[PDB]
From a paper:
A comprehensive function-structure study of a representative of a new clade of proton pumping rhodopsins which we name “mirror proteorhodopsins”, from [name] ([name]) shows cavity/gate architecture of the proton translocation pathway rather resembling channelrhodopsins than the known rhodopsin proton pumps. However, [name] shows completely different pH dependence, operating only as an outwardly directed proton pump only at acidic pH and having no pumping activity under normal and alkaline conditions. Taken together, we believe that the trimer is the native oligomerization state of the protein.
The crystal structure of [name] at 2.8 Å resolution is markedly different from those of the known light-driven proton pumps and, unexpectedly, has remarkable similarities to channelrhodopsins. Similarly to BR, [name] forms trimers in the crystals. Each protomer has seven transmembrane α-helices (A to G) connected with three cytoplasmic and three extracellular loops. The first cavity EC1 (we follow the terms introduced for ChR247) protrudes from the extracellular surface of the protein down to R70 and W74. H37 is found at the position of T46 in BR, therefore, it is closer to the RSB than D96 in case of BR. On the other side, the H37 side chain is located within the hydrogen bond distance from S84 of the helix C. A wide cavity directly connects the cytoplasm to H37 and S84. The histidine residues at the ChR-like cavities and gates explain the inhibition of the light-driven proton-pumping activity by zinc ions.
Residue numbers in the entry:
A (entry chain C): 2 to 228
B (entry chain B): 2 to 229
C (entry chain A): 2 to 60, 63 to 227
């Protein structure tokens, strides 16, 4: 409940501070540290909002949808994707090159979030699942870019940075896949799991995706940079 | 009306897939392919929303406003403008150079859309037209950047890429000008033409602007690259 | 109140036109001119909205959504210009982007959190959010004053002098906003809505119009 949101805020607020301090401030690593440190600060703001039910909509039938949660995802996810794109290019790209991939992957990712929110708010089952599927299509669009063309470039340019990108993407894919799963089985979908259970699961997921991943990604870059 | 939206979605969904696959994946062409392929995918999501009247607000005495339509325009138009800016610079610029023109042209363009939405929703005629005009001012702001300074740079840097930009801009101008015309004539404005007729017209316009233009722009760039 | 908004629109509309015309269209200066000219045009659109009470919420306490909408876009653009100055108009792939994203995220959050504080009808919540917004502002100020300023000075004296001058001016003016909020009807309600509105207009002109011309002069000094 409130306790989960307050735990989320505290973890995310501290983590953001920790990620920046601990993170490298040198050359290419710096801009990765800045991006990774920002995500939790957004998540923190979101979680603080959710504790006081700011942005949280209560349907006539007492059903709750957290706008703040989706608002977080709409900004954070793209920032995490942006960091990955830069890794793939090995921190060098000509005018418009990285920008094109960024725009492509952000558009898909943000749409994935927006469509997911439309699905959540949909009170008609048929519509709810049509939109969920479209969201999933967007997610596959994101995953395709990451796993095929971007990963292709990631490996082509060198083993060290290619190894770092592949490690980061793998971790990202598994964690990111939990969100659509939780949605499906959660109160926004099949309603197999309780609101509180889904919220508690998301907190654990959010910490892995934003905090653990950040420290993991830093180690993979630091290991790769050493070579 | 819903049939038009479903037709729009299907055309835009397929087109997006087609544009990416057909588009070149090499050097400067690649980043143009990625940007051009994204637009229809947004438009598609928008059109799907509109079929189920998701963003659609209904006001008495025949006033409908499709929020999803404007949401599409607020993202797509800038992406199309972004692609043009990159063309003008001949796919090379110093730090912040392209960014300055992007921010400038996006701010004007997005404002043009936002102001247009305010105009559509405005219940006082005087306000509705004040905002329409302000939107038009923004559009002129966009057109100025495209046609004067950006076109100047486009031609100065080389004939091949300059020819491609000029062709793309010309096509852009004519199509983009239809939107303010339809708005004026449409239920959002003078209510001279029916909601359904205006919606069907916009679908035709949207296909030209996002799908036909994409293939046209691609050909003009590939023509310029081969000639060079 | 409406007269202030109409005055704001007219000042901001003309200023934006003036800033572009007067601004240099060459090399690094150009992209600074384009960014600086756009800000007032946003502010203008905002002020026009506010005169006709578009985005203005009646709920007893009144909060101008158009005002915050303006701030959420303009402030980042002004911060973006400063970041570019610090790098001396040269940075490797992703370098400037990382600092931009960092400083924009903090800045935009600062605005949105401030809006949450304004809309909050419960005092305790209103001040929790105000403080969080302030934390974000300090986050912005830190980046500007420490790491970005460090790079600004390290790269050369001329551009380092220009950045330091611009930042100083920015900090002082930008600090008025949280002060006005605190003592204004969105906070302690020590000063009237009209007084706060008229004060913000004066502040907004300094921050977007005067600062633009000041920043332009400082860059032309640095280029010479
Ligand atoms: C390759 C250059 C980067 C393109 C940026 C695309 C701008 C997106 C506009 C979104 C505004 C809403
Ligand atoms: C460094 C330059 C990269 C900047 C990234 C640009 C990303 C643009 C953001 C796109 C957002 C699209 C999501 C909006 C969907 C709205 C569609 C309406 C459906 C109801
Ligand atoms: C929102 C309006 C301004 C968006 C500008 C984004 C352009 C990014 C270029 C680097
Ligand atoms: C040189 C590039 C300048 C980038 C400016 C982008 C402006 C970001 C504002 C978006 C925040 C909107 C929040 C609602
Ligand atoms: C909707 C939010 C999307 C914002 C993501 C923008 C991240 C940009 C990553 C930095 C790119 C810098 C490249 C410079 C060349
Ligand atoms: C060039 C990168 C600018 C993107 C700014 C990030 C927007 C964050 C929104 C909160």
């Amino acid at each position: 409940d409130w306790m989960a949101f307050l735990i989320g805020f505290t973890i995310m607020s501290l983590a953001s501070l920790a990620i920046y301090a601990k993170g490298s401030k040198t050359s290419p690593a710096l801009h990765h540290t800045l991006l990774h440190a920002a995500v939790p600060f957004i998540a923190a703001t979101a979680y603080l909002a959710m504790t006081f039910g700011i942005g949280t909509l209560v349907n006539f039938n007492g059903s709750v949808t957290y706008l703040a949660r989706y608002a977080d995802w709409s900004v954070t996810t793209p920032i995490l994707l942006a960091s990955l794109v830069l890794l793939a290019f090995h921190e060098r790209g000509r005018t418009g090159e990285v920008g094109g991939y960024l725009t492509a992957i952000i558009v898909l990712d943000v749409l994935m979030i927006v469509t997911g929110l439309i699905s959540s708010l949909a009170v008609v089952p048929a519509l709810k699942w049509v939109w969920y599927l479209w969201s999933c299509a967007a997610f596959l669009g994101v995953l395709y870019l990451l796993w095929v063309p971007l990963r292709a470039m990631a490996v082509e340019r060198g083993e060290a940075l290619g190894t770092a990108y592949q490690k980061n993407v793998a971790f990202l894919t598994v964690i990111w896949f939990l969100y659509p799963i939780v949605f499906l089985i959660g109160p926004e979908g099949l309603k197999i799991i309780s609101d509180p259970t889904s919220v508690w699961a998301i907190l654990i997921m959010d910490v892995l995706a934003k905090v653990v991943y950040a420290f993991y990604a830093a180690a993979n870059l630091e290991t790769a940079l050493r070579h």
